[PDB]
């Protein structure tokens, strides 16, 4: 092919930040003679030339420039806008001319007014006491504007270490943060926030997810002489109360000192007359959960 370009389809940024556009190319007609960066170019069919605002011209050309061309005449078309503005948003046009040929390359530059939020990616299955990696992705990375990704649990910064990686190549531009932590059952339903911050820790944007932590049933056991009176062969009722269970429970059974009881497959244990330790067991798709032992005495 005469002109082959490699660059991201779209580059993202927000007002006041910067944008770094990785770009490589190759023209079979040799080195370039002119480069012009257009903003929303329009081909003028009359004059057979391109019109529109010009952000950079190789004929008129520094490090004190907002728009910079970090490339050369043979293989590099990297662009830098520092700072980038909402008006730069749109379709950039890399208008290049070789010895005998011409070419126009389109790069999409999506600049939002406010910093856009990152994205949390949850694994489909999170369960109590099983280490899980949470990933926070941001489709942005520019050297002139360093950022950071902060993990929060119920608005509180998390103490677990988070590996932060960045990519700024012709294929993809992102900032990635991976957090490893072992959740407990109480993390179910709580909010995790990936907060985007600038170099000094100033808030920019955030994404939140409500955790879904599967766990065995957590059981509250209540006995209704309040303790252990009976003193004869009285009537005692014991109830098994599920404090939390994800997913919902399936079966319930009562156990004395060790072995399950006679056909006691209900949430209430009714004794009408056997004076050991008692506890209930409730199961869900995760597995069985037990309650604390109650000691009945005559
Ligand atoms: C090797 C070769 O074929 N070179 C010829 C070169 C390539 O074919 C041309 O660059 C390849 N890209 C495109 O088509 C292109 C790129 C970007 C955008 C765009 C759109 C919206 C926003 C931002 C960007 C649109 C099209 O096209 C030329 O004429 C272009 C021409 C002529 C008449 C009528 C029209 Cl409408 C047009 Cl676009 C030239 O000088 O660019 C002659 C050269 O000889
Ligand atoms: C096209 O050519 C330009 C210029 O040679 C290349 O830009 C250079 O890219 C490197 C990264 O590969 C930049 O290094 C960075 O420096 C900052 C500190 O300024 C540092 O914190 C980073 O970790 C990184 O090391 C370098 O500054 C930059 N040069 C200029 C003048 O901006 C560009 O990579 C080339 N494009 C491709 C697609 O290869």
259: alpha, beta or left? (left if phi > 0; alpha if psi -120 to 50): beta
Handedness of CA 194, 195, 199, 201 (dihedral sign): negative
CA of 91 to the centre of ligand 1 (A): 14
Whole-angstrom Cα Rg for the chain: 32
**Residue minimizing CA distance to atom 19 of ligand 2:** 143
Q: Which atom of ligand 2 is nearest to the CA of 24?
A: 38
Q: For tokens 């919902």, what's the residue?
A: 248
16, with CB counted inside 10 A (0-12, 13-18, 19+), is: middle
- Lookup: tokens for 88: 């730069």
Separation in Å, CA 231 to CA 46, 227, 294, 297: 108, 12, 16, 8
SS3 track for the chain:
CCEEEECCCEEEEECCCCEEECCEEEECCCCCCEEEEEEEEEEECCCCEEEEEEEEECCCCCCCCCEEECCCCCCECCEEECCCCHHHCEEEEEEEECCCCEEEEEEEEEEECCCCCCEEECCCCEECCCCEEEEEEECCCCCCCCEEEEEEECCEECCCCEEEEEEECCCCEEEEEEEEECCCHHHCCCEEEEEEEECCCCEEEEEEEECCEEEEEEEEEEECCCCCCCCCCCCEEEEEEEEEEECCEEEEEEECCCCECCCCCCCEEEECCCCCEEEEEEEECCCEEECCCEECCC
Sequence-distant (6+) residues with CB within 8 A of 186 are none
Residue 114 near residue 100, CB atoms below 8 Å = no
CA of 103 to the centre of ligand 1 (A): 6
What pairing do the DSSP bridges indicate for beta strands 24-27 and 3-6?
A: antiparallel
Handedness of CA 154, 120, 248, 184 (dihedral sign): negative
What is the dihedral angle through the alpha carbons of 173, 153, 198, 196, rounded to the nearest 10 degrees? 40
Distance, CA of 183 to chain centre: 17
**Resolution number, Å:** 2.7
- Lookup: tokens for 298: 């005559």
**Residue minimizing CA distance to atom 14 of ligand 1:** 104
Residues composing the chain: 298
Other residues' Cβ atoms within 10 Å of the Cβ of residue 44: 11
CA of 218 to the centre of ligand 2 (A): 55
Other residues' Cβ atoms within 10 Å of the Cβ of residue 158: 16
272: alpha, beta or left? (left if phi > 0; alpha if psi -120 to 50): alpha
Residue 4 near residue 17, CB atoms below 8 Å = no
Whole-angstrom Cα distance, residue 119 to residue 51?
38
State if residue 101 touches ligand 1 by the CB under 6 angstroms criterion: yes
Other residues' Cβ atoms within 10 Å of the Cβ of residue 23: 21
Sequence-distant (6+) residues with CB within 8 A of 202 are none
Sequence-distant (6+) residues with CB within 8 A of 27 are 2, 3, 96, 98, 101, 103
Other residues' Cβ atoms within 10 Å of the Cβ of residue 245: 22
Whole-angstrom Cα distance, residue 106 to residue 94?
6
């Amino acid at each position: 092919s005469k002109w082959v370009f490699e660059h991201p389809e779209t580059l993202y940024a927000w007002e006041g930040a910067c944008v770094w556009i990785p770009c490589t190319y190759r023209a079979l007609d040799g080195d370039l003679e002119s480069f012009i960066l257009f903003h929303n170019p329009e081909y003028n069919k009359a004059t057979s030339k391109f019109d529109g605002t010009r952000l950079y011209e190789s004929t008129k050309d520094s490090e004190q420039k907002r728009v910079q061309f970090l490339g050369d005449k043979n293989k590099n078309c990297t662009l830098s806008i520092h700072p980038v503005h909402l008006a730069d948003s749109g379709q950039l046009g890399l208008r290049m001319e070789s010895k005998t040929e011409k070419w126009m390359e389109r790069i999409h530059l999506a600049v939002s007014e406010r910093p856009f939020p990152p994205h949390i990616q949850l694994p489909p299955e999170i369960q109590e006491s099983q280490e899980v990696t949470l990933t926070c992705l941001l489709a942005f990375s520019c050297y002139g504007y360093p950022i950071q990704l902060q993990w929060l649990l119920e608005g509180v910064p998390m103490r677990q270490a988070a590996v932060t990686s960045t990519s700024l190549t012709i294929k993809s531009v992102f900032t990635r943060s991976e957090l490893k932590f072992s959740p407990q059952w109480s993390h179910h339903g709580k909010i995790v926030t990936c907060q985007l911050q600038d170099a000094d820790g100033k808030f920019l944007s955030a994404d939140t997810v409500q955790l879904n932590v599967k766990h065995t049933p957590k059981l509250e056991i209540k006995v209704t002489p309040s303790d252990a009176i009976v003193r004869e062969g009285d009537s005692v009722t014991m109830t098994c109360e599920v404090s939390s269970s994800n997913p919902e429970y399936t079966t319930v059974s009562w156990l004395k000192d060790g072995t399950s009881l006679k056909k006691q497959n209900t949430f209430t244990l009714n004794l009408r007359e056997q004076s050991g330790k008692y506890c209930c067991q409730v199961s869900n798709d995760v597995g069985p959960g037990r309650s604390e032992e109650v000691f009945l005495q005559v």
